[PDB]
Amino acid sequence: AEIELTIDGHKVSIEAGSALIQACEKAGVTVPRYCYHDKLAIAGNCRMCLVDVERAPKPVASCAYPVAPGMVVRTDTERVKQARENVMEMMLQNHPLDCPVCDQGGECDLQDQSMRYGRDRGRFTEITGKRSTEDKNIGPLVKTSMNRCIHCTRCVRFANDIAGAPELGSSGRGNDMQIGTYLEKNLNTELSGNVIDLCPVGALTNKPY
Amino acid sequence: QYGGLKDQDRIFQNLYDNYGWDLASARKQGDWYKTKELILKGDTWIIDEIKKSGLRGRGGAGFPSGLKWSFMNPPGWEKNEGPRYLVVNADEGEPGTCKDREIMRKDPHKLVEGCLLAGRAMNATAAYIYIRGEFYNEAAVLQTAINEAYAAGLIGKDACGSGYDFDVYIHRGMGAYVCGEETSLIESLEGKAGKPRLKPPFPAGVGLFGRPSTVTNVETVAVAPTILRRGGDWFASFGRERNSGTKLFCISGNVNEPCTVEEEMSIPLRELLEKHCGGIKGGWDNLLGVIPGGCSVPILPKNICEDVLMDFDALKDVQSGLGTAAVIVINKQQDVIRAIQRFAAFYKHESCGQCTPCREGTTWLLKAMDRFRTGQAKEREIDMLYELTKDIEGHTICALGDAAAWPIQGLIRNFRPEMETRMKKFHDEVGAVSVGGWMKDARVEKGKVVGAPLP
Amino acid sequence: HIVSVHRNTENNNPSIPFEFSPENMKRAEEVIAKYPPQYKKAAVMPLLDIGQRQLGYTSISVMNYVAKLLEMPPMRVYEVATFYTMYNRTPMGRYHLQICTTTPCQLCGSDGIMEAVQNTLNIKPGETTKDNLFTLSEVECLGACVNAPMMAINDDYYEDLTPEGTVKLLEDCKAGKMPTPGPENHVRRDCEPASGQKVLLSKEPHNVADFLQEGI
Amino acid sequence: SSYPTNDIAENPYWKRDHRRAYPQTAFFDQKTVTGLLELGSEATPRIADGEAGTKALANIANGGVSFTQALGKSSKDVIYGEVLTVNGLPPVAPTLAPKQWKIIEGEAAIYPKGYPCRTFH
Amino acid sequence: VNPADRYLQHVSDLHQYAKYIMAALPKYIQGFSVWKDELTLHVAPSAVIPVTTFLRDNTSTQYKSIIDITAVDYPSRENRFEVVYNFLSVRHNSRIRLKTYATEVTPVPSIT
Amino acid sequence: WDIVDVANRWENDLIGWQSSGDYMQATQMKFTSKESAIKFANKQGWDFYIQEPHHRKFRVKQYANNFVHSYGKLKHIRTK
Amino acid sequence: GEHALRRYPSGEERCIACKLCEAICPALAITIDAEERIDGSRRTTKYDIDMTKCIYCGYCQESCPVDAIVETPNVEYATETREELLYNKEKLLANGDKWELELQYALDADAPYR
Amino acid sequence: DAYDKVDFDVPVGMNGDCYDRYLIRMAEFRQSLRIIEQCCNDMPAGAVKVEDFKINSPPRNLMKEDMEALIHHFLLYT
Ligand SMILES: Cc1cc2nc3c(=O)[nH]c(=O)nc-3n(C[C@H](O)[C@H](O)[C@H](O)COP(=O)(O)O)c2cc1C
Ligand code: SF4
Ligand code: SF4
Ligand code: SF4
Ligand code: SF4
Ligand code: SF4
Ligand code: FES
Ligand code: FES
């Protein structure tokens, strides 16, 4: 049955066991996100969706935190604003300066959430520069620019769970973790083009377009 | 006064391979003597004894062992049909620490017995002992002992005729520090890459193979049968309140004689050093710092260890921790900045890469520490580096990120003037530096950066 | 770094057939038996290891064989194999030198050990020897911090090292023999202070049975 | 650039985000001002606690008291403190920065005495 | 520094002033709004002549200069058009705004 | 406005720009409600069509569901 | 003054068809078409400026991330027919080639201030 | 903007005719010259646009080096 909690002072009633980001969406509160998507399994790897919960001592991932009766949630605290800036700072430090040549430009959630929740200027001026990534060929439909990848794993979750195409995955570890097929394989599925919509950034784009 | 451990009060008697690890030798030690009666006693009694013991987690976090074990027994647990699992964490991996390797090599039968007893206390159907892959010979020793225990009906269908079934298996890790994290450990057991899960769900609810599981350190499990035999009050008699019992204290670094030994909690650091390790190389005057516990904890300056007790409470009050009780001393001849840079490199290498704050922040921390090592940085950047650690701390899926943030913070707090001196040395020596380590002659040429050192 | 792309060579190529030897097979059956029947994909890490024992390294052919044997998609096995550093995805030599360079080893001369090894074998820490006999590696903590400057040879630890001692160790390696299974020139029995035991100086250990809880 | 805006180590953007700390436009219809007259204000209350205050707020928020009955009921103290000034006078149309004019005459003037153009400072 | 802060006391003054006006012409003033230094009165069209007369001729207001009149189209409202008047008092160095509404067929009283 | 076939867009023969004869082609009105929009359209004598919006159906999502124990053969390997 | 499209010292065009100039243009004077070049580069296939719509505000030159579209100091390009004032890409590239040296003086003097 | 920081006088007529207005404009010439001189003497150092890149575009050397600056520039111009 539905339980009841409060978000930013408002009262919201939601089915028991639903994720906190679902209750936030129901109560009309906007929460930034990258890896969460309504049609994919919850991942919780981007860390953009942090909120404060009075029982929780540190901010929690909204997308993966189950709601409980009497929960009190604040999406607007100074700690939450600080965390959003911190996460965006870490996300942009290796992201390539590609917006003029990137097809995502102008309809990009990274651009928009940088504008809405991030710092106005960066602090990263390291002389060893940024990480670069090899590009990967997965057929004539989906062009890849993998410097842009922010490792949200939406493409992998869609390709595995929804389309049933397990050739896609993440190889390596740490800074060198790469989305791909680990060897030259097409992303072979009649549903493949959907990953272009799912990729929040210009990492996977429409090649004919 | 705290710390005099007497040999009769010693738990891990084969620590120096003075009595053997054969099952007969462990029998001489008394292992497997009352195991029938310990099983026959109610799980409630084992849990309540472990609670009365004061034992707390030995993998580095020091949660109450009894309560953590109790969580696998909710009121209606039996109604959830299926296997229940005990997982034993022997991933070591924390640089500085060697205790579990000694426990696996010298007293394996004690570990096997601890798995049986804990599994009873948790109503577990089977155990899995997760072992780091570089401990190949340790794995061979532990297997051999487990085969012995299987042979003698100590571990199997009717564990000493208990009517309680237990199976014990070894699973080997293959080179990942993060797999010491309990949820990463479970994911690696299941046949995936060792990326940790978010909590909730907690392992007691949903764990290994989606079943109720509990992940525990090998020293908290290995001491358990001795604890049960000798009584909770006795184990409580050693160490102060809430830090009670006796821990292994591996000591490494710049001491005259490195060692591995067991001692009462709440022992002074000065006394521990002087009496076990022959003391700091050069004398207490020649001590820069000590890291109490492995690389993940903030380093102690010279004048706090003169008064500090090897507990959780005392170390936390001075803003560090016990961790795995892996002491590392650094004398005045070594560079603390180089050591912290090496720790930053370790954390950059051991990040699983799942979550952005860790996956990117560890790399940024390594770049900054490479520049601070040579002095190619501006002084205000120290403050920026401090703020950088706060980007990672408290924002990550698992606690590797907090571990990566902490040593830097200890370094800044305790040795800022060291870094300022190195910066002066660079500025006089090489030239004037901009933020990020740029200098007036540095620019991009035909694919590279030229005009600058490039740390 | 970590190499996370495979490129087909003639020696590392999917077409190359890899089958387990019968003894390795029977072992693989036994290893699979330890996990629930539905969750036998949880044997991928041991099975891959067995493959890397039979053949020199974890090749793509081995990855695909293990993937077929556990009915997994090969990308799941690729993820596992590239995640864990103890899987060697490039072929190596007979002797794998692994120098721990983490801070406890560094504070005690791991840099000197590295210089000795690099001088004897000109190769860099990632490179393998021209005669395909030695392969170096810098590594993180191996769990032997008491044994201050330690090292690994293919499976075995060698501790309390010295530059000249390491030259002699590499020489004995290169001739074919093995000087000592023991970790070092016998200065200690693997964990005690160099001045000898300060505790546990009793000829026989105290049985725990003289202390019992009065409630058994 | 200016300090502290250019600092690399102590300025979160949200502490100087003045666009997002913009003042809300305050709208007052006659029901709200009725409530201000009857119940007093957050600054100086004239409300009872418990259910009494919430029910008073509700019944003004529903239409029970009109603005004109509100004004007639209002006492001398309310009318003088909170509608007029403490002296009973109306408030004057307010000015943000009052300007005191002065007339410059003599040699410092722009034109001499004859011209029909004076100098105001 | 937040630029809005310098207005705070003035904002209070405007509130007080608006209260007086609404208490003096409760037949006419539907409402008022206050943003930093701008005070708006909201009235029905039939209220325009009296209120304007008041604003022009009362001793505490004295809004002698008409600055502008315009309309704003709000197609969602039943009355499309809001008519906006801005007035200046050189006597008191003060500005004020007055709003009413209209449609494509219902006129407003001219203030010529 | 719906497009008119003849007047919508054609290629200019001089420079290649897109010409148009439909003066409404770029106009879009915004309304705060469907009812306000219908009222305005009726008041202007405009023939209209209402396209009712579609919304995402709600379902319960749980992170823990990624790890539920399987009693029989796994239907797929979840990877994360 | 009159617009030009610039090159890199190699001779490659600087414009990569981001279309920021087209978006910012207050007079909607710029019309752009692009696709992938046979070598894989992102490049324009059409770049038009209606000089009789342009207001010579310089916003395109401010917006460009690669200094591709610029205004020269040239004012002496009056024409006898209006058709001559619809600049296509060839005309603009030729203007860049023609005026590059004066453009370099202007950039060397004002680049630090942008 | 800075009119509170400079010193100038205001000319006022009395006849409300074209000649008074001419005299006013001629005096305003002089007062503007006064203010221009004060600005030439008191021009301070620092930025000339608001230092928030969500409002005004960042400088070009940041735009071509820093990721946040490039994003903000792209968004402000599109
Ligand atoms: C990066 C990381 C590595 C860890 N490695 C180990 C380990 O090697 N051995 C261990 O016992 N606990 C390790 N832990 C902590 C355990 O996951 C867990 O918190 C607990 O300490 C184990 O059970 P315990 O209460 O008996 O100590 C690690 C934690 C983190 C965040
Ligand atoms: S993905 Fe977004 S932020 Fe990254 S280059 Fe493309 S448009 Fe810019
Ligand atoms: S390619 Fe796109 S969808 Fe896939 S992980 Fe990277 S950012 Fe996410
Ligand atoms: S904190 Fe680091 S190790 Fe832990 S889950 Fe995140 S990326 Fe992986
Ligand atoms: S100068 Fe201004 S009007 Fe002319 S093309 Fe450039 S942006 Fe458009
Ligand atoms: S001229 Fe510059 S701004 Fe215009 S499309 Fe080309 S690169 Fe983009
Ligand atoms: S959306 Fe919640 S962590 Fe990514
Ligand atoms: S640092 Fe070398 S084994 Fe621990």
- The pocket around ligand 4, CB under 6 angstroms, is made up of B 178, 196, 351-355, 358-359, 396-398, 400-401
Which residue has 């978006």 as its token pair?
A: G23
- Asked whether the beta carbons of G32 and G68 are under 8 A apart, the reply is no
Same domain as B71, residue B184:
yes
Find residues 221-240 of chain B whose CB sits inside 8 Å of chain C: 226, 228-231, 234
* Tokens linked to B316: 């936390």
Same domain as B45, residue B68:
no
Hey, is the C-beta of G110 within 8 angstroms of any chain H C-beta? no
- Taking the C-alpha atoms of residue D16 and residue D8, their distance in angstroms, rounded to an integer, is 14
- Strand ranges across the sheet with A60-61: A10-15, A2-7, A72-74, A50-53, A60-61
CA angle C203, C207, C211 (to 5 degrees): 135
Beta strand segments in B159-244, E:
167-172, 213-217
Hey, is the C-beta of F15 within 8 angstroms of any chain C C-beta? no
- Asked whether the beta carbons of B270 and B89 are under 8 A apart, the reply is no
Same domain as B186, residue B50:
no
Same domain as B116, residue B248:
no
Q: Residue A142 in 3-state DSSP?
A: strand
Q: Which of C38, C72, C75 sits opposite F72 (nearest CB)?
A: C38
Taking CA atoms, C8 is separated from A98, C14, C51, in Å, by 31, 8, 19
Taking CA atoms, G111 is separated from A125, G61, G104, H59, H68, in Å, by 21, 12, 10, 10, 21
Query: Does the distance separating the beta carbons of H64 and G65 come in below 8 Å?
Result: yes
Count the alpha carbons within 13 Å of B204 in the hemisphere toward its beta carbon: 13
Q: Determine phi and psi for E33, rounding to 5 degrees.
A: -135, 150
Same domain as B151, residue B231:
yes
Whether residue B37 is contained in a domain is answered as yes
Find residues 40-59 of chain E whose CB sits inside 8 Å of chain D: none
Taking CA atoms, G16 is separated from A104, G30, G36, G43, G70, in Å, by 15, 15, 10, 5, 14
Q: After which residues is chain G broken (C to N over 2.5 A)?
A: none
Those residues with Cβ within 8 angstroms of residue E73's Cβ, 6 or more apart along the chain or in another chain: E80, E81
Which residues on D lie below 8 Å from A78 (Cβ)? 14
Same domain as B247, residue B214:
no
Distance between first and last Cα of chain H:
29
Calculate how close chain G gets to A127, using CA atoms only, in Å.
22
Burial class (CB in 10 A: 0-12, 13-18, 19+), A69: exposed
Query: Does the distance separating the beta carbons of H20 and D116 come in below 8 Å?
Result: yes
Query: Does the distance separating the beta carbons of G88 and F14 come in below 8 Å?
Result: no
- CA A191 to centroid of chain Cα atoms: 21
- Taking the C-alpha atoms of residue B186 and residue B173, their distance in angstroms, rounded to an integer, is 11
Distance between first and last Cα of chain F:
46
Kindly report the number of other CB atoms within 10 A of residue B17's CB atom.
15
- Taking the C-alpha atoms of residue C8 and residue C143, their distance in angstroms, rounded to an integer, is 36
- Kindly tell me the number of DSSP H helices and DSSP E strands found in chain D: 4, 3
Same domain as B305, residue B276:
yes
Which residues on H lie below 8 Å from A119 (Cβ)? 68
Same domain as B209, residue B61:
yes
Those residues with Cβ within 8 angstroms of residue A84's Cβ, 6 or more apart along the chain or in another chain: A32, A48, A50, A117, A118
Q: After which residues is chain E broken (C to N over 2.5 A)?
A: none
Same domain as B183, residue B89:
yes
Which residue out of C97, C98, C99, C100 has the highest number of ligand 8 atoms within 8 Å of its CB and is therefore the one to mutate? Answer: C100
Query: Does the distance separating the beta carbons of H64 and A122 come in below 8 Å?
Result: no
Q: Which ligand is nearest to the CA of A203?
A: 3
**Residue G69 Cα to ligand 1 middle (Å):** 59
The CATH number of residue B133's host domain is: 3.40.50.11540
- Taking the C-alpha atoms of residue A78 and residue A59, their distance in angstroms, rounded to an integer, is 12
- Taking the C-alpha atoms of residue G14 and residue C183, their distance in angstroms, rounded to an integer, is 64
Whether residue B393 is contained in a domain is answered as yes
* Share in percent of chain D as helix, strand, coil (round to 5): 35, 10, 55
Q: Determine phi and psi for B376, rounding to 5 degrees.
A: -80, 70
Residues comprising chain B, all counted: 455
Instruction: Classify strands B287-291 and B300-301 as parallel, antiparallel or unpaired.
Output: antiparallel
- Taking the C-alpha atoms of residue E103 and residue C87, their distance in angstroms, rounded to an integer, is 79
CA angle A182, C59, C2 (to 5 degrees): 50
Q: Which of H11, B175, B334, D46 is nearest to C107 (CA)?
A: B334
Would you say G95 is a known binding-site residue?
no
- Taking the C-alpha atoms of residue B356 and residue A50, their distance in angstroms, rounded to an integer, is 13
Q: Which ligand is nearest to the CA of A47?
A: 7
Count the alpha carbons within 13 Å of B118 in the hemisphere toward its beta carbon: 36
Which residue has 């965006």 as its token pair?
A: A88
Interface size, chain A vs chain C, as Cβ–Cβ contacts under 8 Å: 52
- Taking the C-alpha atoms of residue B269 and residue B46, their distance in angstroms, rounded to an integer, is 33
Q: Print the domain residue range for B283.
A: 238-334
Same domain as B364, residue B264:
no
- Domains held by chain F: number: 1
Which residues on A lie below 8 Å from F58 (Cβ)? 15, 22, 26
Residue B90 CA, closest ligand 1 atom number: 9
- CA C86 to centroid of chain Cα atoms: 7
Taking the alpha carbons of C57, C60, C65, C67 in that order, is the dihedral positive or negative?
positive
Burial class (CB in 10 A: 0-12, 13-18, 19+), H16: exposed
Q: Which of B395, B369, B364 is nearest to B382 (CA)?
A: B369
Instruction: Classify strands C134-139 and C95-100 as parallel, antiparallel or unpaired.
Output: parallel
- Asked whether the beta carbons of A19 and A67 are under 8 A apart, the reply is yes
Q: Where are the domains of chain D?
A: 2-121
- Taking the C-alpha atoms of residue H45 and residue H23, their distance in angstroms, rounded to an integer, is 37
- Taking the C-alpha atoms of residue D82 and residue D74, their distance in angstroms, rounded to an integer, is 10
DSSP string covering B356-406: HHHHHHHHHHHHHHHHHHHT-S-THHHHHHHHHHHHHTTTSSSTHHHHHHH
- Asked whether the beta carbons of A135 and A202 are under 8 A apart, the reply is no
Resolution in A: 2.4
Hey, is the C-beta of A135 within 8 angstroms of any chain G C-beta? no
Which residue has 């030995």 as its token pair?
A: B58
Same domain as B428, residue B360:
yes
- Kindly tell me the number of DSSP H helices and DSSP E strands found in chain H: 3, 1
Calculate how close chain B gets to C134, using CA atoms only, in Å.
19
Residue of C nearest to B345 (CA): C102
Helix (H) or strand (E) holding B25: helix B23-29
- Taking the C-alpha atoms of residue F71 and residue A110, their distance in angstroms, rounded to an integer, is 41
Query: Does the distance separating the beta carbons of F66 and A161 come in below 8 Å?
Result: no
* Tokens linked to D27: 């709208």
DSSP string covering B427-451: HHHT----TTS--TT-EEETTEEES
**Residue A114 Cα to ligand 5 middle (Å):** 28
* Tokens linked to D88: 């009973």
Residue of F nearest to C36 (CA): F71
Which residue out of B183, B358, B360, B393 has the highest number of ligand 4 atoms within 8 Å of its CB and is therefore the one to mutate? Answer: B358
* Tokens linked to A68: 């409980």
Residue B398 CA, closest ligand 1 atom number: 31
Interface probe for B, chosen from C49, C147, C200 (most Cβ of B below 10 Å), is C200
Query: Does the distance separating the beta carbons of B392 and A174 come in below 8 Å?
Result: no
Would you say G54 is a known binding-site residue?
yes
Taking CA atoms, B239 is separated from B234, B244, C47, H66, in Å, by 11, 4, 45, 55
- Taking the C-alpha atoms of residue B382 and residue B372, their distance in angstroms, rounded to an integer, is 9
Residues comprising chain H, all counted: 78
Calculate how close chain B gets to C190, using CA atoms only, in Å.
8
Q: Determine phi and psi for C64, rounding to 5 degrees.
A: -70, -35
Q: Which of B190, B14, E14 is nearest to C208 (CA)?
A: B14
Which residues on F lie below 8 Å from G52 (Cβ)? none
- Asked whether the beta carbons of E49 and E100 are under 8 A apart, the reply is no
Q: Which of D5, D19, D118 sits opposite H54 (nearest CB)?
A: D19
**Residue B398 Cα to ligand 7 middle (Å):** 14
Q: Which of D14, D25, D30 is nearest to D69 (CA)?
A: D30
Give the long-range contacts of residues F28-37, CB within 8 A, separation 24 or more. Answer: F29/E75, F30/E75, F31/E75, F31/E76, F32/E76, F33/E76, F36/E75, F36/E76, F36/E77
Which residue has 């699979």 as its token pair?
A: C32
Residue of A nearest to C1 (CA): A176
Hey, is the C-beta of E77 within 8 angstroms of any chain D C-beta? no
**Residue F54 Cα to ligand 7 middle (Å):** 25
Those residues with Cβ within 8 angstroms of residue C124's Cβ, 6 or more apart along the chain or in another chain: C118, C136
Q: Which of A33, A38, A35 is nearest to A22 (CA)?
A: A38
- Asked whether the beta carbons of B223 and B245 are under 8 A apart, the reply is yes
Method by which this entry was solved = cryo-EM
Q: Which of E31, F28, C141 is nearest to B294 (CA)?
A: C141
Q: Which ligand is nearest to the CA of A115?
A: 2
* Tokens linked to B301: 């300056």
- Asked whether the beta carbons of B249 and B263 are under 8 A apart, the reply is yes
Query: Does the distance separating the beta carbons of G86 and F14 come in below 8 Å?
Result: yes
Distance between first and last Cα of chain C:
56
Which residues on H lie below 8 Å from A115 (Cβ)? 54, 71-72, 75
Residues comprising chain G, all counted: 114
Same domain as B35, residue B70:
no
Q: Determine phi and psi for B116, rounding to 5 degrees.
A: -60, -50
